[PDB]
Amino acid sequence: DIQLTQSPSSLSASVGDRVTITCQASQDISNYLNWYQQRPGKAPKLLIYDASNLETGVPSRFSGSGSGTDFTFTISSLQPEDIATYYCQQYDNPPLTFGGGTKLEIKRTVAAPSVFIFPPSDEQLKSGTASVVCLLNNFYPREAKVQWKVDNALQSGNSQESVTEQDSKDSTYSLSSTLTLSKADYEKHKVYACEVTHQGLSSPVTKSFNRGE
């Protein structure tokens, strides 16, 4: 089989920069090489076919080049919607093979997160489990720290985080921290807070609530 080595593994560039991805075939594959773009949760979308031909509707900032074993995919001016993983695929000989993929990330200005806090619902409190949520909306960069406090006591090991992919428009991230307690332990305390530290914040931002108030 023909092996396609795609480089780099991942890269971060600013909006308007020139982006270059390479794909090397183990053997000569002439120009039978295609470039697909896959957005998070979506199917791969054909951007380039036969090394250098643009698919209908593909912006002119996308281009391809190469013949033989080395191929190049180029975005002349990176745009916020270009966030995705890119793949190279050969069909010179079966079985058809794909490249390892190149995840494209965007570097933008610092954006502080908007922090919200959500107590557990009564419908869930009926079930004996309480799930408190802390939301960090639209921030950049990706790194941030969330600290749960129950009656000012720091928590650990009872929470899980989930981060969204870079938003295809403002190039920001969004994080959700779920703290899970038993109904007895939830009813045994009063103040519940999440403290957020991020590069865009000069001081940690704490969003809190009192149970039953």
Add this chain to the structure above:
Amino acid sequence: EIVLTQSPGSLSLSPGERATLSCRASQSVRSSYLGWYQQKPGQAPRLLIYGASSRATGIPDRFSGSGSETDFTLTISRLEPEDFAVYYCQQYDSSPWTFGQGTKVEIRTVAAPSVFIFPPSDEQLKSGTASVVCLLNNFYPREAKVQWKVDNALQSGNSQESVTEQDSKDSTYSLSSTLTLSKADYEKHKVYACEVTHQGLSSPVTKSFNRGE
């Protein structure tokens, strides 16, 4: 050019009763290419109705439009606190697409201002200029007087005033009076006061401080 006559130039009305706004065309306009926009102070305009009588998506039922050939009317059934902004009519009929002059709408009960005074910071005193601030917070109506006193000597020609627009929640105003002095003249005196007169005050409210006390 199609001249858009806007009447009235100003409209002072209490919230709750019916509101009628007229847009007059210099010549007949096909009642379809026409839109109404609300510009909130310091904000981008937002479409309310198109086609004179068709309500756009996201606008409550309280807003309605009457369309004709030359006359166009916008009626608000129930005035809301956040519905106090400037209203412009536009025709897409014949180029140029002129805009109406815009009918500003305002009103509430007499509210007395809360007066605060701020001495110049040390960091500013390092620069050679001193700025004393007098804040009049949350008041109505808009007319009021601030008078500066430096060692009981009334000041004139060295103070500037700034006023925020009508607040979207309580329909009140806020004013800031800045007194600018040299560092030498600021250090040459001791007492600094601002005296406020307003309809809600039976006596002038004076807020003062002593330099270095």
Add this chain to the structure above:
Amino acid sequence: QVQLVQSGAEVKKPGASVKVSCKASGYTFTSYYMHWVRQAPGQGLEWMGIINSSGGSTSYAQKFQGRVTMTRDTSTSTVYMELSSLRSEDTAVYYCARPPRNYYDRSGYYQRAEYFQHWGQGTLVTVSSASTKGPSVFPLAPSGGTAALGCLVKDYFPEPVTVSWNSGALTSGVHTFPAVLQSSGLYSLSSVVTVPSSSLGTQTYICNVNHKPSNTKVDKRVEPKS
């Protein structure tokens, strides 16, 4: 208008078999080849095989020869892919892809054009012995500014669940977080949306959650707590 619609996500035990469909519409069905490409969670793309939509002749990759069978039905314009002897390495999203028609050049040589111009939405096949559980949807209530509300979709298996707002009418400022795998082996995610605080007393906010492996459809009304 070329549409490729695949069947819902499934969960099968290791060693069983699964059959994924792909109904084609908006074009002459029998005029194009249909390829299948699978993608493991967080991994790359893997080409599986090709089927001729007219005659039904197939060609599979070597590592799948004997485990995969591709069939076609022209009366319904549907391509089927069946994989038997399932292992944990087969848990993946499977896509049906359509490239254009192959051609001939002047010297009379058959020229293939295998660049996938159309794709199906994919079908998640989860190879697991664990049972299927439907989730529970709890409201995340908001408390001139900006408010945030949402829905917590907790305790389900397998992935995925799909969350929309107001039957897809509300897409602005919506963030549906990836599912977390709790210690109980069940998945839990949250779908939030930021709205104007002035719209809380007028606009109705309903989250629509769909977990197809368990046939669960829930429309939860999210209201401020009173």
Add this chain to the structure above:
Amino acid sequence: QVQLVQSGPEVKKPGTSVKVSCKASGFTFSSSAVQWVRQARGQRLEWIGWIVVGSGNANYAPRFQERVTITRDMSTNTAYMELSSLRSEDTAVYYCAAPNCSRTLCYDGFNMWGQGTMVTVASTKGPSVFPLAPSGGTAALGCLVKDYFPEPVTVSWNSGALTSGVHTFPAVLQSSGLYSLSSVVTVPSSSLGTQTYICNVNHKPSNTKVDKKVEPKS
């Protein structure tokens, strides 16, 4: 989340040519068309001109037909407006609007709008941010943003976590030709020694980003 995001504010000496751009996202660009208008601070809106991105046909107002050039780049989904021979009264906030157009049908009204970009027609100076310190009632604190040309400065509190009770006064133009404003907030007096209050001031023309901490004086 269909939207129309444009560039930040530019400030350029008289006589030069200014380029404004609006990038659309979330919808089919080629189907719609973009109108360009302007509004001076305290005055009505004025219509510069509209262009069809799909056709490329541009129509300008009779007043500014010679000095404006409205173009479009369809590859990046962007509409450009260039103003030549910038005159001092041309300082205003410029807006770009477009209806929410899908591939099949178009919305009958200018649904979407740009954020509004200010244009000033002197040299650029960064401001100085001075604290306005507070002295179970209600206390008031704030920040004085002084001596900057030109507008606008954007002031948030605690990076946006504090919005209720905040008044950002319109900027005043001093005798020196530089602008100055104040952004104040009223808080409960019981939180002055518990809650930290930081004003975040941004003056993009001078690339000035300041976070000033406001404490009671000691």
Add this chain to the structure above:
Amino acid sequence: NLCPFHEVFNATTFASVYAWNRKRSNCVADYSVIYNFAPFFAFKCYGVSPTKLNDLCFTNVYADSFVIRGNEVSQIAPGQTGNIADYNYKLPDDFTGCVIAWNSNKLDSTPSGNYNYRYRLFRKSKLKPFERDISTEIYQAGNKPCNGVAGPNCYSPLQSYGFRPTYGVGHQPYRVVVLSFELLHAPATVCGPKK
């Protein structure tokens, strides 16, 4: 008494893509006369092997000639989307025939711009296979009656290319001839030189 291929390829002026010309028998399909015009690219004959064309017989042969731009040549193929494929010339998905395209910046370009070649830009529906549209009704951005007024939210459905010699190959004019081999239940009229 012969297949006049030159009349399609050696023609002085091709038609616009929105009004593409069709010509269609009783003859010997001697395709060599087409090489007086040099080989180009992507004969991309679908369902037909051209080296067998010289020993095959067909009921009729339809030559559809027009001119587009470079970066749209890929749309003249079965199952393609885009401006030309949707609103000007549509090939069926079961197309059994050939597409011969070649650059003609030497022929269809002038220094001032060849605005005679036109293409449809707006249409409410996508074209059916082999369907021609020569409408001139002004489309309206919305649902309104322009009444012929071409201006605000009211667009001329046709736009001119304006070919100039200084354009890039993606924007240079390309002459296209689509050959459709019609096999009906009827006596064959066009045979190869080898029958």
